[PDB]
């Protein structure tokens, strides 16, 4: 099927609104004596040095 | 081009108007001359590291040659039939420059 009418700005912006990203939730870790922020998923791997904190 | 290398010229128009100088190089096909002391520019040199200052050409119209008593002039031509020559004379005083 094919769109019958060109779609209006309100209706275009209504579901262009749903295409968003969510910010990851960060927690603090201490590496080499200085504090960094990492996801809680990668907390252990940062605590034993397997994620590269730039 | 009626104005050559090496002859003193008074810049007659433009910002540096009122300045004597000497033509260091003539560009006959561009109607331009390069006369020292006037129309200076400030150019950036990528390096001896710094910013340079030299001259840039002025249109040959903007400058008039100087007489034998330091008065600007238009230049005409006389014929020296003794050698077939075509000599530059100063229209103001009637002698060469």
């Amino acid at each position: 099927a094919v769109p019958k009418r060109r779609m209006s700005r309100a209706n275009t912006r209504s579901r262009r609104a749903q295409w968003k990203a969510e910010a990851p939730g960060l927690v603090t870790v201490s590496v080499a004596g200085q504090q960094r922020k990492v996801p809680r998923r990668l907390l252990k791997a940062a605590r034993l040095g397997l994620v590269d904190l730039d | 081009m009626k104005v050559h290398k090496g002859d003193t010229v008074l810049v007659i128009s433009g910002k540096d108007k009122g300045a004597k100088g000497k033509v260091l190089v003539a560009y006959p096909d561009r109607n331009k001359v390069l006369v020292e002391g006037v129309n200076r520019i400030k150019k950036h040199t990528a390096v001896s590291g710094g910013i340079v200052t030299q001259e840039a050409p002025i249109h040959v119209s903007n400058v008039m040659v100087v007489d034998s008593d330091g008065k600007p002039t238009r230049v005409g031509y006389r014929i020296d039939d003794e050698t077939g020559k075509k000599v530059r004379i100063a229209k103001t005083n009637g002698k060469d420059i």
Binding site: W19, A21, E22, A23, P24, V38 | -
Partner: protein, 114 residues
């Protein structure tokens, strides 16, 4: 008003609407918080925008000479840039158009009080 520093990144090979989708994460935040959020956010458009933010911070480091930790990303947005047009050949001799889009990311950060 607050003292401010600016940074612009033009002709970045990222769609404007795909840059905005990670710009909307970090608007109006401290510079360090924004850089962390971008560093752990799993969208590629973070790479340009992050750099731009960092660049602005450095300007306040080196041209306004103001405190690193007071910086907040006050304004950030992504303008459209030039588009290149290409052709993808399709079935039965059709030829469809492809847009290679770009962006200009602009950031102004301010040194607000704590």
């Amino acid at each position: 008003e607050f003292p401010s520093a600016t940074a612009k990144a033009r002709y970045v090979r990222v769609s404007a609407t795909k840059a905005r989708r990670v710009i909307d994460l970090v608007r109006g935040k401290s510079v360090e918080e924004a850089l962390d959020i971008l560093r752990w956010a799993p969208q590629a458009a973070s790479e340009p925008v992050a750099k731009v933010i960092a660049s602005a911070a450095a300007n306040a480091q080196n041209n306004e000479g103001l405190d690193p930790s007071t910086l907040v990303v006050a304004t950030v947005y992504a303008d459209e840039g030039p588009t290149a047009k290409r052709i993808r050949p399709r079935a039965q001799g059709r030829a469809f158009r492809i847009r290679k889009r770009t962006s200009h990311i602009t950031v102004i950060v301010e040194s607000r009080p704590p």
